[PDB]
């Protein structure tokens, strides 16, 4: 069973702005997603201070980067707090509404796309390099769900029947044809060392076989 939802008009037209605007500094997408993973890991670590059973679904707090040249996908996995179904549909969209509005206001005042993280909507920078984004997430209080959107005004949510994750969030970036450079090991290392050197969690860059 697949449910189809519409983006709020503000989020939809920001996504099209990220897709259609000529902006060469696309590498910042990785910084925003890694930063999003770092925030989710901080959340579960803090909550586990007053409730250690919240780590029964996994005690390791880390970030994995998985390039796949055959599928043309780049996957960012974290063992953070994860997201519930209401997070995917209601809660985060409400936050992204006001954050998107403020971001596009600044973009006309001279700001550029790289400052998207200051408005809390850094996730949508994934569409600088991806034509489709899939989000697999598992929260301690909810089932495993699969969110997905190729922009165009809508997204889908379904119960995930794939590999159980224990806890956390998996962001799968189906890259554009001309953005295969972010599947190369040396390029990812250069971006991580440039924008995410001080992230307080281990970042493991998986090598292909
Ligand atoms: O994008 C939507 N839902 C899935 C969000 S998961 C990635 C994410 C996206 C934005 C932010 Cl600020 C944080 C995390 C949406 C939009 C309207 C209803 O839902």
DSSP string of 6-22, one letter each residue: EPPHHHHHHHHHHHHS-
Q: Torsions phi, psi of 155, nearest 5?
A: -145, 160
CA distance 21 to 157: 27
**If you take atom 18 of ligand 1, which residue's CA is the nearest one?**
93
Q: How far is the CA of 180 from the centre of ligand 1 (A)?
A: 25
In this structure, the dihedral spanned by the alpha carbons of residues 142, 91, 89 and 133, taken in order and rounded to 10 degrees, is: -90
- CATH number of the structural domain spanning residue 52: 3.30.565.10
Structural domain that includes position 69 = 2-205
CA distance 123 to 105: 18
Rg for the chain, CA atoms, rounded? 17
Please tell me the total count of domains within the chain.
Answer: 1
Chain centre distance of CA 202? 17
| Structure determination technique employed | X-ray
Q: How many residues does the chain have?
A: 209
Residue 174 CA: distances (Å) to CA of 50, 110, 162: 38, 30, 17
Q: Is the CB of 89 under 6 A from ligand 1?
A: yes
Q: Which residues contact 115 (CB under 8 A, 6 or more apart)?
A: 103, 106
What is the resolution in angstroms? Answer: 2.3
CA distance 166 to 138: 7
Question: What DSSP assignment string belongs to 86-136?
Answer: HIIIIIHHHHHHHHHHHHHHHHHTT--GGGGGGGT-GGGGGGGTEEEEEEE
Residue 164 CA: distances (Å) to CA of 57, 169, 171, 196: 11, 11, 15, 28
Q: How far is the CA of 92 from the centre of ligand 1 (A)?
A: 5
DSSP state at residue 80: S
**Structure tokens, 108:** 């006309």
Looking up tokens 């697999």 gives: 136
Whether residue 123 is annotated as binding a ligand: the answer is yes
Q: Which residues contact 89 (CB under 8 A, 6 or more apart)?
A: 5, 157
């Amino acid at each position: 069973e697949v449910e189809t939802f519409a983006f709020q008009a503000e989020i939809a037209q920001l996504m099209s702005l990220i897709i259609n605007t000529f902006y060469s500094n696309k590498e910042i997408f990785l910084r925003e997603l890694i930063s999003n993973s770092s925030d989710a890991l901080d959340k579960i670590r803090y909550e586990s201070l007053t409730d250690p059973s919240k780590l029964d679904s996994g005690k390791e707090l880390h970030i994995n980067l998985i390039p796949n040249k055959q599928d043309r996908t780049l996957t960012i996995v974290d063992t953070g707090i994860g997201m519930t179904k209401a997070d995917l549909i209601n809660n985060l969209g409400t936050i992204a509404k006001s954050g998107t509005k403020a971001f596009m206001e600044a973009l006309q005042a001279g700001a550029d796309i790289s400052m998207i993280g200051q408005f809390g909507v850094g996730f949508y920078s994934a569409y600088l390099v991806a034509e489709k984004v899939t989000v697999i997430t598992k929260h301690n209080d909810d089932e495993q769900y699969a969110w997905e959107s190729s922009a165009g005004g809508s997204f889908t949510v379904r119960t995930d029947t794939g590999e159980p994750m224990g806890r956390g969030t998996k962001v799968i970036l189906h890259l554009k044809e001309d953005q295969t450079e972010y599947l190369e090991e040396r390029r990812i290392k250069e971006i991580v060392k440039k924008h995410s050197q001080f992230i307080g969690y281990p970042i493991t860059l998986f090598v292909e076989k």
